[PDB]
Amino acid sequence: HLKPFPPEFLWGAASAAYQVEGAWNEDGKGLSVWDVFAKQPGRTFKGTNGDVAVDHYHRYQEDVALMAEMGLKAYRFSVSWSRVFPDGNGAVNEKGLDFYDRLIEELRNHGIEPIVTLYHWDVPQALMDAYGAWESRRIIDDFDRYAVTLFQRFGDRVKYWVTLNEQNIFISFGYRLGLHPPGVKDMKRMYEANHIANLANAKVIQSFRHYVPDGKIGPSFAYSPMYPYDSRPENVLAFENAEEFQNHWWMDVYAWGMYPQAAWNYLESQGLEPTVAPGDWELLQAAKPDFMGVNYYQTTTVEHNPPDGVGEGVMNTTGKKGTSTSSGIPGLFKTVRNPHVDTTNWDWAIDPVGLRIGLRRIANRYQLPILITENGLGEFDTLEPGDIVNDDYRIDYLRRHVQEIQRAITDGVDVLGYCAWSFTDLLSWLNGYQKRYGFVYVNRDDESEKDLRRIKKKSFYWYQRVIETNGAEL
Amino acid sequence: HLKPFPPEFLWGAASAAYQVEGAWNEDGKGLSVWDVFAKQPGRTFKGTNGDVAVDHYHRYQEDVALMAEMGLKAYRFSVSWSRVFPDGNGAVNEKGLDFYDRLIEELRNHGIEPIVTLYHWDVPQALMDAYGAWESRRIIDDFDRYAVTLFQRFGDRVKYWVTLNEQNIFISFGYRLGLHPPGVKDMKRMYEANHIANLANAKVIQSFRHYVPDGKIGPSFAYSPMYPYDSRPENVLAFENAEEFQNHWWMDVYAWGMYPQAAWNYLESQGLEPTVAPGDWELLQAAKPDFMGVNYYQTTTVEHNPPDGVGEGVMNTTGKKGTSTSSGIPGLFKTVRNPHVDTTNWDWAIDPVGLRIGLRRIANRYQLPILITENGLGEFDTLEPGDIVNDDYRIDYLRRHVQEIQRAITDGVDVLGYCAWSFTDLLSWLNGYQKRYGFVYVNRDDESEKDLRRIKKKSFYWYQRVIETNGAEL
Numbered sequence: 001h002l003k004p005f006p007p008e009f010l011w012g013a014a015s016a017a018y019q020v021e022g023a024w025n026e027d028g029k030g031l032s033v034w035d036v037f038a039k040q041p042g043r044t045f046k047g048t049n050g051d052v053a054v055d056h057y058h059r060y061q062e063d064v065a066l067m068a069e070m071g072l073k074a075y076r077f078s079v080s081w082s083r084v085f086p087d088g089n090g091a092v093n094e095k096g097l098d099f100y101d102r103l104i105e106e107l108r109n110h111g112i113e114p115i116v117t118l119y120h121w122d123v124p125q126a127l128m129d130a131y132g133a134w135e136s137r138r139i140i141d142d143f144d145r146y147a148v149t150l151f152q153r154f155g156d157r158v159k160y161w162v163t164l165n166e167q168n169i170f171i172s173f174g175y176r177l178g179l180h181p182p183g184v185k186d187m188k189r190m191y192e193a194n195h196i197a198n199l200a201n202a203k204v205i206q207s208f209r210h211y212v213p214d215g216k217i218g219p220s221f222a223y224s225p226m227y228p229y230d231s232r233p234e235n236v237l238a239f240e241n242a243e244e245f246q247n248h249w250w251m252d253v254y255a256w257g258m259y260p261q262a263a264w265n266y267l268e269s270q271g272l273e274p275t276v277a278p279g280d281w282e283l284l285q286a287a288k289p290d291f292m293g294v295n296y297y298q299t300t301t302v303e304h305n306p307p308d309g310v311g312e313g314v315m316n317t318t319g320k321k322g323t324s325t326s327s328g329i330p331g332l333f334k335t336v337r338n339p340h341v342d343t344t345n346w347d348w349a350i351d352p353v354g355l356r357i358g359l360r361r362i363a364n365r366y367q368l369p370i371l372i373t374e375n376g377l378g379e380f381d382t383l384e385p386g387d388i389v390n391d392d393y394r395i396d397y398l399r400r401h402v403q404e405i406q407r408a409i410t411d412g413v414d415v416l417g418y419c420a421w422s423f424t425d426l427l428s429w430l431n432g433y434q435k436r437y438g439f440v441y442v443n444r445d446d447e448s449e450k451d452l453r454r455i456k457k458k459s460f461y462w463y464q465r466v467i468e469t470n471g472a473e474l
Numbered sequence: 475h476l477k478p479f480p481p482e483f484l485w486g487a488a489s490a491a492y493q494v495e496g497a498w499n500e501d502g503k504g505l506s507v508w509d510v511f512a513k514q515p516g517r518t519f520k521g522t523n524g525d526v527a528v529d530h531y532h533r534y535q536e537d538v539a540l541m542a543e544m545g546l547k548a549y550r551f552s553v554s555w556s557r558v559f560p561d562g563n564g565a566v567n568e569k570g571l572d573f574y575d576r577l578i579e580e581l582r583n584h585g586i587e588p589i590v591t592l593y594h595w596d597v598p599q600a601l602m603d604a605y606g607a608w609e610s611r612r613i614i615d616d617f618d619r620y621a622v623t624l625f626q627r628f629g630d631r632v633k634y635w636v637t638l639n640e641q642n643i644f645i646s647f648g649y650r651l652g653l654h655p656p657g658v659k660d661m662k663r664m665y666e667a668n669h670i671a672n673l674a675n676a677k678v679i680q681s682f683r684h685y686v687p688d689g690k691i692g693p694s695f696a697y698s699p700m701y702p703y704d705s706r707p708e709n710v711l712a713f714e715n716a717e718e719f720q721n722h723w724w725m726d727v728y729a730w731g732m733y734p735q736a737a738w739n740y741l742e743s744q745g746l747e748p749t750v751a752p753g754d755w756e757l758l759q760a761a762k763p764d765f766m767g768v769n770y771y772q773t774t775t776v777e778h779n780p781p782d783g784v785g786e787g788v789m790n791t792t793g794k795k796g797t798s799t800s801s802g803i804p805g806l807f808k809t810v811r812n813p814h815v816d817t818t819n820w821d822w823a824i825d826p827v828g829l830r831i832g833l834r835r836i837a838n839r840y841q842l843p844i845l846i847t848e849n850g851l852g853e854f855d856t857l858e859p860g861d862i863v864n865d866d867y868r869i870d871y872l873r874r875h876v877q878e879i880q881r882a883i884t885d886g887v888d889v890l891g892y893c894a895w896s897f898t899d900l901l902s903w904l905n906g907y908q909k910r911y912g913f914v915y916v917n918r919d920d921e922s923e924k925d926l927r928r929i930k931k932k933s934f935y936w937y938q939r940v941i942e943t944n945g946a947e948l
């Protein structure tokens with residue numbers, strides 16, 4: 001017998017500024033590292049970039065009207081740092097703030113709760129130019145100043161805040177895999193910037209307690225819960241290393257203010273552990289969040305990896321299912337295909353029970369409320385005659401995940417809300433447009449920009465009914 | 475490259491008073507619940523009991539000399555509460571305290587560190603008669619009077635103390651399985667008694683901070699780390715249930731003063747959650763231990779268990795391999811044979827890497843030092859002419875477990891010592907005498923005490939060499 005979703009459950013949907021806004025140089029916006037990075041030849045699929053994206057900066061009023069039509073309780077979006085401080089640390093651009101003000105007013109005027117994400121990977125290029133951005137402690141006070149500006153300006157209107165979105169992703173992709181700005185492949189630098197990002201997160205949660213005392217705030221972690229392949233003890237030990245190295249490495253710092261000891265020691269033995277200054281541990285431990293943001297898409301199964309074994313694998317860019325290969329850390333663990341779940345054609349696991357497992361792990365380990373900030377299925381959509389997009393695949397994925405959430409709530413996990421990814425189709429950081437996540441189809445592809453018109457998918461109406469029946473009808 | 479065992483590592487061996495002492499009615503000792511229980515027909519194998527056991531009460535000088543010959547750094551034993559308070563809570567039996575004084579003096583005169591266990595399952599029968607022993611809050615103050623009696627008498631000479639030894643066993647075997655005193659099969663009563671023992675534990679740790687400010691104290695948990703059968707999400711979820719219900723239910727209280735939420739809610743949904751009094755959480759949270767004691771023998775593998783599925787299983791007390799059957803909680807998990815490890819003739823898994831995994835989990839979850847208070851292999855031994863016992867099976871098991879401890883120390887786990895179970899052969903609570911654990915064979919069986927003579931097994935000389943080289947030579 002399932003509990004119902006609490007009466008004030010935030011049924012949400014989410015975006016990210018670069019992925020959606022466009023207007024990349026209007027009204028005084030400065031350059032971000034993704035403005036520069038995406039125009040480098042060969043970085044992004046068919047040269048796609050966010051100059052226009054889906055042009056939400058100009059079309060937000062139509063976008064919010066579709067949200068109100070849908071009945072969204074909440075909308076999560078990111079603020080573009082380079083719209084607010086074109087220099088990162090110089091004068092504030094009032095036109096930048098004014099757009100987010102207009103967006104929030106538009107949201108409230110329709111009874112939609114705004115959830116403001118502070119950082120979704122778009123640090124101003126000037127700060128990377130001036131001092132290497134996340135590799136310098138100077139970004140801590142610059143990021144604080146930016147966050148305080150938003151707190152003072154929108155705190156009276158925004159209850160829910162997310163600090164850093166998927167810090168493990170932009171640190172990892174940006175400094176170990178070289179796939180994101182700044183395009184670095186250097187684990188020593190990766191963990192230095194990661195540590196500085198941890199301090200930046202902690203500093204702004206501290207500021208938030210001062211400036212928005214009645215608000216709620218937390219980082220959002222890209223969480224892939226680890227599984228052992230089988231009950232072979234070597235495989236279970238590999239799972240212990242993987243969950244601590246991939247997940248606790250970040251979530252223990254968010255929740256407890258301290259890195260896990262075994263992973264630290266392994267980094268120390270390699271000379272990779274971050275530099276620590278007086279006052280770091282005090283700050284990190286004094287910044288408890290109200291919730292743990294969670295972006296979930298899939299679980300990961302691991303097995304034993306000998307000292308000689310797998311390192312970086314082969315990411316699935318194409319869509320040709322089967323093209324991924326095992327990624328690992330020699331001596332600790334390597335990934336392996338989970339024979340008991342389906343995958344998308346991008347080799348992503350379809351594992352809604354894994355969401356319940358991950359929600360249970362966070363509550364069991366930290367006793368924190370959880371806001372699901374991102375969950376969704378990316379797939380090709382066909383526009384059929386009569387403005388019909390039949391994305392039954394997308395409905396099937398979201399339904400099962402929402403079902404497992406309800407089971408998590410019945411187990412006792414405190415789930416504050418759920419933000420499907422995404423509201424409209426949007427620009428993928430690297431893979432262009434044809435892998436869509438939206439409830440609302442946007443009329444463009446990789447070659448033709450067309451007119452960017454919004455078309456309601458079948459999933460739009462499925463999710464309209466979910467919100468109307470507070471989850472009772474799925 | 476492995477770290478060495480720390481220079482003050484407590485290389486130990488262990489026993490329990492009922493299992494070893496004998497002299498059940500000598501020198502003013504009162505009856506314990508096990509004196510009474512084991513003499514009820516059908517409770518124990520071939521009617522074996524602790525009347526004589528291996529007569530360590532009279533023979534402790536011989537036994538300590540053998541410890542000294544082996545070069546033991548520490549000896550862990552339990553104090554028989556009914557020797558000290560014959561009626562549990564009245565006047566002290568000075569002769570009872572005097573035995574443990576002579577024992578501790580004998581150990582210190584041979585340079586062996588005593589590790590005193592306060593409770594190893596033998597509450598005096600008179601407290602069971604007066605108010606039902608662990609089922610009544612009365613026991614909190616009675617157990618405290620007894621602990622403080624020991625603290626004041628021996629605190630000057632004993633630095634390392636264990637409170638409750640395997641609370642999860644004597645509570646669940648006593649109140650859920652009906653296999654230990656008081657022979658109850660009632661889940662509601664089991665969790666009430668469990669909660670009272672949590673309070674008794676916290677109360678004496680609190681008293682210890684006053685009476686033995688320089689000592690170190692912890693409970694000792696019977697830890698079987700759980701494994702999922704495979705990466706099937708339903709099986710990983712049964713692992714999450716199993717680890718929380720069987721392990722976190724006790725260790726979270728010991729480390730954090732808090733029961734885990736999902737397990738609590740499942741018990742509440744069944745009317746099984748314990749009665750909580752004002753001030754309980756305050757006491758439980760303000761009694762941090764210096765270490766987590768760990769009794770390890772095996773891991774447990776689990777799979778999905780439907781709500782009509784498995785409950786109590788068949789236990790193996792004979793010695794014929796393949797007799798045990800699955801046990802579980804319907805709707806949460808059930809155990810299953812781990813196909814990737816061997817088992818003993820009693821169906822206990824042999825999983826030395828599981829010890830590393832369990833030690834890693836405790837450090838990762840609680841950041842506590844660990845004292846391994848029990849680990850050993852129980853098997854039939856053959857006494858060969860010339861008083862020779864070749865127990866290579868025991869050496870092999872101890873060697874691989876001690877090896878995995880060093881890998882755990884290298885990972886960063888703070889392991890304070892290792893107490894092999896047991897120093898001499900002793901009486902098994904239910905299994906009689908033939909399932910032997912000792913380094914020192916004791917000449918007796920289930921039918922005759924014979925001359926109870928002590929015979930060093932081959933593993934005696936192996937462990938002697940382990941200690942002499944501080945574990946460099948295994």
Ligand SMILES: O=P(O)(O)OC[C@H]1O[C@@H](O)[C@H](O)[C@@H](O)[C@@H]1O
Binds near residue numbers: 016169374428
């Ligand atoms: O590469 P894909 O399939 O388009 O997935 C990208 C999505 O994956 C998530 O990790 C990001 O938070 C999103 O911003 C992004 O939309």
Ligand SMILES: O=P(O)(O)OC[C@H]1O[C@@H](O)[C@H](O)[C@@H](O)[C@@H]1O
Binds near residue numbers: 852
């Ligand atoms: O294997 P057996 O004979 O059932 O014994 C298990 C042993 O290990 C633990 O369960 C107890 O702490 C010991 O007292 C006991 O002797």
